[PDB]
């Protein structure tokens, strides 16, 4: 069972565009961000036009319109900035929009210097809390750059990302684990997914684990079972149609869950109910599932209207619903409803450990 709620779409700004990454309100509740892509059929329009919506207000208009010059390859909210919107681009500059200024252009654009990114940033993110935060931009070039949300003309802390060999690490949708232990996992271009540190001389790339050959599209981490498990588990996504569960100590671990007749594009599993991961396809199917109940099948899955290549999906934080980003500019909103967080749900840990023994 999947509770298909309302949808968000506006032809005024989703006119034959590609829905890029998403994010829910990391500060507010259920008011999400939608990064888009350029539509070369409309060259007069801005390339990257981000948009937001408000599920808690129950309306249809894209509440805010924001648009830099280039195509926004990534976007999300800002940590403890209830007026700001951070953003990655295709060119390499990192933008910064504001809502209260009513300026449909970002007010603080990262330069295009070598010290900054001159390659698209697929994953730019805030990290800790009030005093524990920063802004880490990681372009596909292979550089990380810490930035304050105040100073943006120069990266606060910045270094590259290379393996033991001096070859580049074409990152794609990295993710910090729970707690910001600075050991963020990095979805590389294809295979060689890495764990990478930030503080110490050992910062950067820790080790390579390869369990799939198709080019990576996403990664995610999660939290506690209700203070039962460590939950450092992180699942990935790739173009080989398979999704592998990983560990911080394995190299070719846990069963690579494969969805056939579909090009996997993203995974993100809500820490609420320790295992409820949702993958997507290049056909219009949301085949999400829990590993405790099922084993290798989508639990309460659904397909999507028409055949949209579902680009990105995000669980509604601290609760349950699903944001859906397609290859076509349209946002769909589903919900589990009946797939409530099971209490004392350690069945999954016993399950994954029993599978891990073979």
């Amino acid at each position: 069972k999947l509770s298909l709620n309302r949808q968000f779409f506006d032809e005024r700004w989703s006119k034959h565009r590609v829905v890029s990454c998403l994010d829910w309100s990391s500060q507010y509740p259920e008011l999400l961000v939608a990064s888009y892509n350029n539509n070369e059929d409309a060259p007069h329009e801005p390339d990257g036009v981000a948009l937001v919506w408000n599920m808690k207000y129950k309306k249809t208009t894209p509440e805010y319109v924001f648009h830099c010059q280039s195509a926004v390859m990534s976007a999300t909210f800002a940590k403890f900035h209830p007026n700001l919107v951070v953003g990655g681009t295709y060119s390499g500059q990192i933008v910064l929009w504001d809502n209260r200024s009513n300026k449909r252009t970002p007010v603080q654009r990262t330069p295009l210097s070598a010290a900054a990114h001159t390659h698209p940033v697929y994953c730019v993110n805030v990290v800790g809390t009030q005093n524990a935060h920063n802004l880490i931009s990681i372009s596909t070039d292979g550089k990380i750059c810490s930035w304050s949300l105040d100073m943006l003309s120069h990266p606060q802390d910045s270094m590259e990302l290379v393996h033991k060999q001096s070859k580049a690490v074409a990152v794609t949708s990295m993710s910090f684990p729970v707690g910001d232990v600075n050991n963020f996992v990095v979805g590389s271009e294809e295979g060689s997914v890495y764990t990478a540190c930030r503080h110490g001389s050992k910062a950067g790339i820790s080790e390579m684990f390869e369990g799939h050959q198709g080019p990576i599209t996403g990664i995610h981490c999660h939290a506690a079972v209700g203070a039962v498990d460590f939950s450092h588990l992180f699942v990935t996504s790739s173009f080989d149609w398979t999704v592998k569960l990983w560990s911080t100590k394995n190299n070719k671990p846990l069963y690579s869950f494969e969805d056939n007749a579909g090009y996997v594009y993203d995974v993100m599993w809500s820490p609420t109910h320790p295992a409820l991961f949702a993958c997507v396809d290049g056909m219009g199917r949301l085949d999400l599932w829990n590993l405790n109940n099922d084993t290798e099948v989508p639990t309460a899955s659904i397909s999507v209207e028409g055949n949209p290549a579902l680009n990105r999906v995000r669980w509604t934080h601290s609760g349950r619903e699903i944001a859906v980003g397609d290859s076509e500019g349209q946002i769909v909103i589903y919900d589990v409803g009946e797939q409530i967080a099971v209490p004392r749900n350690d069945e999954w840990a016993r399950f994954g450990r029993t599978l891990a023994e073979i």
Partner: protein, 198 residues
């Protein structure tokens, strides 16, 4: 235990036909090649060249094809080959292997790049170039000379890390020279575009 093999022989029919269903479905997917399929848009969104997206998509279908072949290899071991319908499965697979070939694309890539991109590589000197744009009034704009070269750099990196060939070293070093001057050009191009918009 050749006792399970009896019901296996019974469902050999259903197993081989269902696997034929899936392989012909793959045939339908390949026949709707990469520039047509949604893999083109998605692969371009994640910034993959058409060469790279095409050959990656093709090798993924190759892997899924041999994956089904591995399934049938598990079905009977060796009897599935010269089976009642496995003899046709083998044919479907062989023709589908010939369909799924990327050396043609690799050759066309190295070809085109060595047919006309021999001079496209180091076009860094003439930084600015005026234009002509046949429209009403026939205006002229400003343009820097780095349009496909940057994608060629990405192409080489993708082939090298992805599969790795005996990639033309001259093109690799010319790509290296384009890389070491590329960010400058990005900044210039965006400045020009913002200038035009203003």
């Amino acid at each position: 235990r050749p006792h399970i093999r009896g019901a296996i022989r019974e469902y050999q029919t259903q197993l081989i036909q269902r696997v034929k269903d899936d392989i012909e479905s793959l045939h339908d997917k390949f026949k709707v090649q990469y520039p047509q399929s949604q893999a083109c848009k998605m692969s371009h969104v994640r910034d993959l060249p058409p060469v790279s997206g095409s050959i990656i998509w093709a090798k993924q279908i190759d892997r899924q094809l041999t994956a089904y072949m591995k399934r049938v290899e598990d079905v009977l071991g060796k009897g599935w080959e010269n089976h009642v319908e496995g003899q046709k499965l083998k044919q479907d697979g062989d023709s589908f292997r010939m369909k799924l070939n990327t050396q043609e694309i690799f050759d066309d890539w190295a070809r085109k790049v060595q047919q006309r991109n021999l001079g496209v590589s180091g076009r860094i000197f003439t930084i600015e170039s005026t234009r002509v744009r046949g429209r009403t009034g026939n205006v002229l704009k400003l343009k820097v000379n780095f349009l496909p070269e940057i994608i060629t750099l990405s192409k080489e990196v993708r082939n090298l890390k992805w599969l790795g060939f005996r990639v033309p070293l001259a093109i690799v070093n010319k790509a290296h020279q384009a890389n070491q001057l590329y960010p400058f050009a990005i900044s210039l191009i965006e400045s020009v575009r913002t200038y035009e918009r203003t």
